[PDB]
Write a protein that binds this ligand. Sequence first.
Ligand code: MG
Ligand code: MG
Ligand code: MG
Ligand code: MG
Ligand code: MG
Ligand code: MG
Ligand code: MG
Ligand code: MG
Ligand code: MG
Ligand code: MG
Ligand code: MG
Ligand code: MG
Ligand code: MG
Ligand code: MG
Ligand code: MG
Ligand code: MG
Ligand code: MG
Ligand code: MG
Ligand code: MG
Ligand code: MG
Ligand code: MG
Ligand code: MG
Ligand code: MG
Ligand code: MG
Ligand code: MG
Ligand code: MG
Ligand code: MG
Ligand code: MG
Ligand code: MG
Ligand code: MG
Ligand code: MG
Ligand code: MG
Ligand code: MG
Ligand code: MG
Ligand code: MG
Ligand code: MG
Ligand code: MG
Ligand code: MG
Ligand code: MG
Ligand code: MG
Ligand code: MG
Ligand code: MG
Ligand code: MG
Ligand code: MG
Ligand code: MG
Ligand code: MG
Ligand code: MG
Ligand code: MG
Ligand code: MG
Ligand code: MG
Ligand code: MG
Ligand code: MG
Ligand code: MG
Ligand code: MG
Ligand code: MG
Ligand code: MG
Ligand code: MG
Ligand code: MG
Ligand code: MG
Ligand code: MG
Ligand code: MG
Ligand code: MG
Ligand code: MG
Ligand code: MG
Ligand code: MG
Ligand code: MG
Ligand code: MG
Ligand code: MG
Ligand code: MG
Ligand code: MG
Ligand code: MG
Ligand code: MG
Ligand code: MG
Ligand code: MG
Ligand code: MG
Ligand code: MG
Ligand code: MG
Ligand code: MG
Ligand code: MG
Ligand code: MG
Ligand code: MG
Ligand code: MG
Ligand code: MG
Ligand code: MG
Ligand code: MG
Ligand code: MG
Ligand code: MG
Ligand code: MG
Ligand code: MG
Ligand code: MG
Ligand code: MG
Ligand code: MG
Ligand code: MG
Ligand code: MG
Ligand code: MG
Ligand code: MG
Ligand code: MG
Ligand code: MG
Ligand code: MG
Ligand code: MG
Ligand code: MG
Ligand code: MG
Ligand code: MG
Ligand code: MG
Ligand code: MG
Ligand code: MG
Ligand code: MG
Ligand code: MG
Ligand code: MG
Ligand code: MG
Ligand code: MG
Ligand code: MG
Ligand code: MG
Ligand code: MG
Ligand code: MG
Ligand code: MG
Ligand code: MG
Ligand code: MG
Ligand code: MG
Ligand code: MG
Ligand code: MG
Ligand code: MG
Ligand code: MG
Ligand code: MG
Ligand code: MG
Ligand code: MG
Ligand code: MG
Ligand code: MG
Lengths: 46, 275
Amino acid sequence: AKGKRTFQPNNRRRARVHGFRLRMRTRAGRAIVANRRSKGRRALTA
Amino acid sequence: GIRKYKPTTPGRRGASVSDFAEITRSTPEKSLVRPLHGKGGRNAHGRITTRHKGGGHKRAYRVIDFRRHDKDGVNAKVAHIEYDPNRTANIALLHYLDGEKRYIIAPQGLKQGDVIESGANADIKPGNNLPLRNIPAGTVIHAVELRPGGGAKLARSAGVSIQLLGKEGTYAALRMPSGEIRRVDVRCRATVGEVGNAEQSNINWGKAGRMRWKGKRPTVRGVVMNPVDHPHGGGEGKTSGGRHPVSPWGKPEGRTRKPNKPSDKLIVRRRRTGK
RNA sequence: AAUUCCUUGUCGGGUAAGUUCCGACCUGCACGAAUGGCGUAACGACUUCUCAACUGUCUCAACCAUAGACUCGGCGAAAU
RNA sequence: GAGUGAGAAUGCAGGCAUGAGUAGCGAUUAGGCAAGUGAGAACCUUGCCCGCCGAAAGACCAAGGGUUCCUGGGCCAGGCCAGUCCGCCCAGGGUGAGUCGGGACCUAAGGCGAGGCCGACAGGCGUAGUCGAUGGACAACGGGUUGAUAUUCCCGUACCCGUGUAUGUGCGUCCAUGAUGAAUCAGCGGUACUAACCAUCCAAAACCACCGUGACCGCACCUUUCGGGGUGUGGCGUUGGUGGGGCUGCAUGGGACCUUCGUUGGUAGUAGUCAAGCGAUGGGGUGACGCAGGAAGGUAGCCGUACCGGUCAGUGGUAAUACCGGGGUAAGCCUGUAGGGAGUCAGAUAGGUAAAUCCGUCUGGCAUAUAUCCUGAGAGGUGAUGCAUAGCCGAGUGAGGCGAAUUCGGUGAUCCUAUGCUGCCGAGAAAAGCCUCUAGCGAGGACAUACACGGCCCGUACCCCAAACCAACACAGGUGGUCAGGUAGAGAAUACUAAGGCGUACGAGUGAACUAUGGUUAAGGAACUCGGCAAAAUGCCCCCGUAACUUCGGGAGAAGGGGGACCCACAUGGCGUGUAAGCCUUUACGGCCCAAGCGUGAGUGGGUGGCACAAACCAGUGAGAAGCGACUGUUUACUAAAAACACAGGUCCGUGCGAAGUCGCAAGACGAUGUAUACGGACUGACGCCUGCCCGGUGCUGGAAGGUUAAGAGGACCCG
RNA sequence: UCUACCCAUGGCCAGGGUGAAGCGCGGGUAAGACCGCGUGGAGGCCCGAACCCACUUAGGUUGAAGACUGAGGGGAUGAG
RNA sequence: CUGCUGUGAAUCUGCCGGGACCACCCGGUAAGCCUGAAUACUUCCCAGUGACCGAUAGCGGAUUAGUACCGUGAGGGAAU
Ligand SMILES: [Mg+2]
Ligand SMILES: [Mg+2]
Ligand SMILES: [Mg+2]
Ligand SMILES: [Mg+2]
Ligand SMILES: [Mg+2]
Ligand SMILES: [Mg+2]
Ligand SMILES: [Mg+2]
Ligand SMILES: [Mg+2]
Ligand SMILES: [Mg+2]
Ligand SMILES: [Mg+2]
Ligand SMILES: [Mg+2]
Ligand SMILES: [Mg+2]
Ligand SMILES: [Mg+2]
Ligand SMILES: [Mg+2]
Ligand SMILES: [Mg+2]
Ligand SMILES: [Mg+2]
Ligand SMILES: [Mg+2]
Ligand SMILES: [Mg+2]
Ligand SMILES: [Mg+2]
Ligand SMILES: [Mg+2]
Ligand SMILES: [Mg+2]
Ligand SMILES: [Mg+2]
Ligand SMILES: [Mg+2]
Ligand SMILES: [Mg+2]
Ligand SMILES: [Mg+2]
Ligand SMILES: [Mg+2]
Ligand SMILES: [Mg+2]
Ligand SMILES: [Mg+2]
Ligand SMILES: [Mg+2]
Ligand SMILES: [Mg+2]
Ligand SMILES: [Mg+2]
Ligand SMILES: [Mg+2]
Ligand SMILES: [Mg+2]
Ligand SMILES: [Mg+2]
Ligand SMILES: [Mg+2]
Ligand SMILES: [Mg+2]
Ligand SMILES: [Mg+2]
Ligand SMILES: [Mg+2]
Ligand SMILES: [Mg+2]
Ligand SMILES: [Mg+2]
Ligand SMILES: [Mg+2]
Ligand SMILES: [Mg+2]
Ligand SMILES: [Mg+2]
Ligand SMILES: [Mg+2]
Ligand SMILES: [Mg+2]
Ligand SMILES: [Mg+2]
Ligand SMILES: [Mg+2]
Ligand SMILES: [Mg+2]
Ligand SMILES: [Mg+2]
Ligand SMILES: [Mg+2]
Ligand SMILES: [Mg+2]
Ligand SMILES: [Mg+2]
Ligand SMILES: [Mg+2]
Ligand SMILES: [Mg+2]
Ligand SMILES: [Mg+2]
Ligand SMILES: [Mg+2]
Ligand SMILES: [Mg+2]
Ligand SMILES: [Mg+2]
Ligand SMILES: [Mg+2]
Ligand SMILES: [Mg+2]
Ligand SMILES: [Mg+2]
Ligand SMILES: [Mg+2]
Ligand SMILES: [Mg+2]
Ligand SMILES: [Mg+2]
Ligand SMILES: [Mg+2]
Ligand SMILES: [Mg+2]
Ligand SMILES: [Mg+2]
Ligand SMILES: [Mg+2]
Ligand SMILES: [Mg+2]
Ligand SMILES: [Mg+2]
Ligand SMILES: [Mg+2]
Ligand SMILES: [Mg+2]
Ligand SMILES: [Mg+2]
Ligand SMILES: [Mg+2]
Ligand SMILES: [Mg+2]
Ligand SMILES: [Mg+2]
Ligand SMILES: [Mg+2]
Ligand SMILES: [Mg+2]
Ligand SMILES: [Mg+2]
Ligand SMILES: [Mg+2]
Ligand SMILES: [Mg+2]
Ligand SMILES: [Mg+2]
Ligand SMILES: [Mg+2]
Ligand SMILES: [Mg+2]
Ligand SMILES: [Mg+2]
Ligand SMILES: [Mg+2]
Ligand SMILES: [Mg+2]
Ligand SMILES: [Mg+2]
Ligand SMILES: [Mg+2]
Ligand SMILES: [Mg+2]
Ligand SMILES: [Mg+2]
Ligand SMILES: [Mg+2]
Ligand SMILES: [Mg+2]
Ligand SMILES: [Mg+2]
Ligand SMILES: [Mg+2]
Ligand SMILES: [Mg+2]
Ligand SMILES: [Mg+2]
Ligand SMILES: [Mg+2]
Ligand SMILES: [Mg+2]
Ligand SMILES: [Mg+2]
Ligand SMILES: [Mg+2]
Ligand SMILES: [Mg+2]
Ligand SMILES: [Mg+2]
Ligand SMILES: [Mg+2]
Ligand SMILES: [Mg+2]
Ligand SMILES: [Mg+2]
Ligand SMILES: [Mg+2]
Ligand SMILES: [Mg+2]
Ligand SMILES: [Mg+2]
Ligand SMILES: [Mg+2]
Ligand SMILES: [Mg+2]
Ligand SMILES: [Mg+2]
Ligand SMILES: [Mg+2]
Ligand SMILES: [Mg+2]
Ligand SMILES: [Mg+2]
Ligand SMILES: [Mg+2]
Ligand SMILES: [Mg+2]
Ligand SMILES: [Mg+2]
Ligand SMILES: [Mg+2]
Ligand SMILES: [Mg+2]
Ligand SMILES: [Mg+2]
Ligand SMILES: [Mg+2]
Ligand SMILES: [Mg+2]
Ligand SMILES: [Mg+2]
Ligand SMILES: [Mg+2]
Ligand SMILES: [Mg+2]
Ligand SMILES: [Mg+2]
Ligand SMILES: [Mg+2]
């Protein structure tokens, strides 16, 4: 009777895996942020 | 000693445990214990490098003086002989008469109240630690150094020892517990006598769970792999590997020591293989 | 024989009737000694054979209730 | 000059048909009536019933959600129907902290990481550090109040950090007072790191003798006389191997010439130092840790009761004799019980980065102390002339006012003492905090009293086993923690119930076939079928009694047989508890014993009722063989749970140590704070008896006289 | 953020059986062995809820659900 | 012409090039450095033009447009 779906929300973990600071510390993340800014997203990152 | 378990369960049928008979205390010394955690067999990349390592009871480190070099001429009566999770041998808490406590590997037949002394003028009562220069050629020694100052590295597992065959110039020719004869700088420091707890290799661990308490995980073998996981995997039904035996990464059985090692000038004879 | 094609091999047991089963025989198509061989108490939601008890599994089906089906009002799809 | 012509691309978009007014309208609880509201009511409001949950379908949270909460209004969309209602729409309102949960405190796994090392660059790791709770430290409880918050507001009583002021004891810098340990002059005795010196381990360059040649030959010489070859001694000569000699040469340890450390006649406790207080970022102790298993002492809770307040429930009896309801109250501050733990005093002493009077260590004197200290459930007091409560009232929309008794027991924890105690091996975080010592800072400072103050930032509404989170839905699925009434009962199972909460969102009918889910079934009893699939059956407690086989543990609840209800008596019995009465003593928060009071099985004999006495619900079918795997375990999320994997045991191979192996370009890491009784790899797979032959092939390991072979050295000879 | 394995730090596991070593007593033994009795509380022990699984079957199979439900089923102090 | 490695001279009757190489002729003067113009492009601003589209077209976007929404996330992405 297992019915556990894949998405389990957690605000802190979502921040520490997808957040602004983690996107910035690396190089591909800064690329992603610049790309999203150029596209026009109102939300660059989690 | 060894005490056997009554077959009250299928998991105790042939098992046995140690008689912790030399264990005089059941609690370590507080000021000589460091935090120790488990690594899972995983290195600085987080990846498994040695397989079959995990679970296992929590243990803490006891600080052993493998480098018994600063207490020369200062006696130390044995305080306690106690357990250690990180060795096969027990450990002995030494009470140096200057007022300082240390841990050593307990030799065979070491008792409480035994005076242990260090230095070139130390006697050859088991337990005493002194340079290879000063032990007569023919003593049975344990916990010997490889380089003069590096601390004990050789013959420190439980029940083993090294026979000092002789001395030539500034080298001492002495045989490993493996049967190999090696030559070590005569300025190295050694401890006299065999290692205790010699019976610990006679004990049946009984059940898979008991060996899992030790930090050991199940070993799957290649013949039941798939050819993508092991060179031995594949085939329909049981196979012998269909191939000369190899490691998971393809390497064949054979000598594996690095040729032309700098220490290869210090090995008189290598070890025997099966006669 | 988790292995035997030939094969439902042969003999006994078991059934009223035995191609499975059990005990043996050896003509081992094409067992065999750590890809272990032969036994083995305990264990098994394992595979197989049997007895007792028990029964709608069956001879052979009947009846009762509830949810649907069915009728009335409301909303109201679908693959094709 | 063309984006120039569609009917097909299981073509793309939009609008609309066919099925069709058809299926469905989302569990296993279930609704009814009276009244109200309103245009309209099965569904909304109110009352009275009935039913369901009740280890939840109740109460409170975390995560997640985000305004869904309250009030007023609404009824177009949403709600699987309607809707006056709504978790839906609209507007306004609502979340109050020194003590709760976090930060301002501390660290773990880990993350990042000044310099750093590594790497063509991009980058990889990482030191010091600094973050990082799921853990450690740290001060508040009961009642009341709003439509909506409540250890937050208020009331009552507390506790914890700072701060200022006034007063009190009162050590002190100065005086002065003690304690004080010295040194120099010079007389000295060893203790000295310092030659030269001695013993020890090893061989500097080295001979002798026994025994052989790595190849040549002179050989005892042998074999078809000599084909090949070769057992064996010798010289040229050593792959040379072995046992001998002391000076000798190196290093290791030792006293001693050398210095220094201690001793004193007089001058000179002169001069200096300690004796208030704060004291580390340094030293140390603690913090500080597992699992299982009781027993004992408690309290909560529950069940009765003295006492209190009341009822008459339109029935045959029942007026107090019966029935119903009360039979309450925290932290804190006192006291220090049951339990549990603990020697004390002095001297010397680098071992603790320096110093320690602290800690370790070694010595010594005392009595095992009902002493003393620490801790510690609970009882008791106080908190509390307060607060709350069964009720009672005028008197209604209900705001309000008054308010009795509260005593003894039984039972009893999964909660507390308890971070205890006892066993066991698998041998069980860190840091701050706190305490302590000196380094140091120091002329003031310590404890107390009274008054007046400062106590920061973030969350707090509401849901939270759910129509408010994860599931596209108001979805039969999923979701961590706390609390745990009664009666049967071993029980947190099951049946029924209390408090509390629901009746959850299509209905009303109707004896069709058929499907699903339950029930019963004459006679037979596996005749069914691939197969006893599915159902049926056994099922509990107590006595009696149990096989082959066995590894001596088991098999075993083997198998099998008898009893079980209610009343009475034995019985004012026995047992637990325990008041009085009494006994005993360190005299008390004592122990012993026990009438009473309460609670409570077991049998024994007699009787009684029924078809039936473990009456419902709950709750093993058993026996005999064979194959495989020994065993408990693991596995193809979503057709395979198995004999397959694992396993404890066995062997083989590798590895002498930043090992081997593995991750990396490297540095580096794991292996392992391990060291051959260890670690990695391969096969086998508890146990018992054993494991034959083949080394030709292919690998592995080892060896070298030859054959063959790269780059590199060579450049004769030839050509321009 | 599902899942596989590991690392740190926490929590949970109703109720009831069995009765290991160890200790103590006695018997027996030149002395043992051993037995009977007790205390004792072991175990990848047993029965069995919470919890975790997923063996059988029936239903579902334009579902209530893109893997569920009902009735039984295995583990349940541990490789949980 | 040029990179890594090894070897490694001459200062002008030198040294380099002229498609292996040599001789002769010719051209030049390496191992030092600066350098405008003519050439490439358009985030942005101004002004224009089109035998360009005209709301399923033209930008994904004439309107909430990188919006709503879908995804853990990179990202995908409307209709009016
Ligand atoms: Mg599942
Ligand atoms: Mg990383
Ligand atoms: Mg291994
Ligand atoms: Mg050990
Ligand atoms: Mg062993
Ligand atoms: Mg075993
Ligand atoms: Mg193995
Ligand atoms: Mg294996
Ligand atoms: Mg493979
Ligand atoms: Mg391969
Ligand atoms: Mg295979
Ligand atoms: Mg095969
Ligand atoms: Mg057969
Ligand atoms: Mg065969
Ligand atoms: Mg046949
Ligand atoms: Mg026959
Ligand atoms: Mg047979
Ligand atoms: Mg094999
Ligand atoms: Mg075979
Ligand atoms: Mg074989
Ligand atoms: Mg086998
Ligand atoms: Mg067999
Ligand atoms: Mg068997
Ligand atoms: Mg199993
Ligand atoms: Mg199966
Ligand atoms: Mg008929
Ligand atoms: Mg119906
Ligand atoms: Mg209709
Ligand atoms: Mg066209
Ligand atoms: Mg058309
Ligand atoms: Mg078309
Ligand atoms: Mg269409
Ligand atoms: Mg139509
Ligand atoms: Mg039709
Ligand atoms: Mg129809
Ligand atoms: Mg219908
Ligand atoms: Mg419904
Ligand atoms: Mg009405
Ligand atoms: Mg009920
Ligand atoms: Mg209940
Ligand atoms: Mg609730
Ligand atoms: Mg509301
Ligand atoms: Mg409406
Ligand atoms: Mg509607
Ligand atoms: Mg309203
Ligand atoms: Mg509302
Ligand atoms: Mg405050
Ligand atoms: Mg760190
Ligand atoms: Mg840097
Ligand atoms: Mg790093
Ligand atoms: Mg922090
Ligand atoms: Mg926390
Ligand atoms: Mg509220
Ligand atoms: Mg309150
Ligand atoms: Mg510790
Ligand atoms: Mg315990
Ligand atoms: Mg008790
Ligand atoms: Mg009457
Ligand atoms: Mg009463
Ligand atoms: Mg001391
Ligand atoms: Mg009290
Ligand atoms: Mg919030
Ligand atoms: Mg609140
Ligand atoms: Mg609240
Ligand atoms: Mg919450
Ligand atoms: Mg609903
Ligand atoms: Mg929703
Ligand atoms: Mg739900
Ligand atoms: Mg759960
Ligand atoms: Mg109950
Ligand atoms: Mg229940
Ligand atoms: Mg009620
Ligand atoms: Mg009909
Ligand atoms: Mg039926
Ligand atoms: Mg019948
Ligand atoms: Mg009958
Ligand atoms: Mg039968
Ligand atoms: Mg038949
Ligand atoms: Mg039959
Ligand atoms: Mg038939
Ligand atoms: Mg069945
Ligand atoms: Mg049944
Ligand atoms: Mg029996
Ligand atoms: Mg049997
Ligand atoms: Mg029985
Ligand atoms: Mg009394
Ligand atoms: Mg008296
Ligand atoms: Mg008395
Ligand atoms: Mg009768
Ligand atoms: Mg049962
Ligand atoms: Mg057989
Ligand atoms: Mg087997
Ligand atoms: Mg098995
Ligand atoms: Mg499957
Ligand atoms: Mg299974
Ligand atoms: Mg299955
Ligand atoms: Mg398998
Ligand atoms: Mg092994
Ligand atoms: Mg092998
Ligand atoms: Mg290596
Ligand atoms: Mg080996
Ligand atoms: Mg096998
Ligand atoms: Mg074997
Ligand atoms: Mg063999
Ligand atoms: Mg062979
Ligand atoms: Mg061979
Ligand atoms: Mg060979
Ligand atoms: Mg060979
Ligand atoms: Mg070779
Ligand atoms: Mg060359
Ligand atoms: Mg016992
Ligand atoms: Mg015993
Ligand atoms: Mg068990
Ligand atoms: Mg079982
Ligand atoms: Mg069970
Ligand atoms: Mg069961
Ligand atoms: Mg179960
Ligand atoms: Mg699974
Ligand atoms: Mg099955
Ligand atoms: Mg259907
Ligand atoms: Mg349905
Ligand atoms: Mg099922
Ligand atoms: Mg089920
Ligand atoms: Mg330039
Ligand atoms: Mg457009
Ligand atoms: Mg138009
Ligand atoms: Mg578009
Ligand atoms: Mg999103």
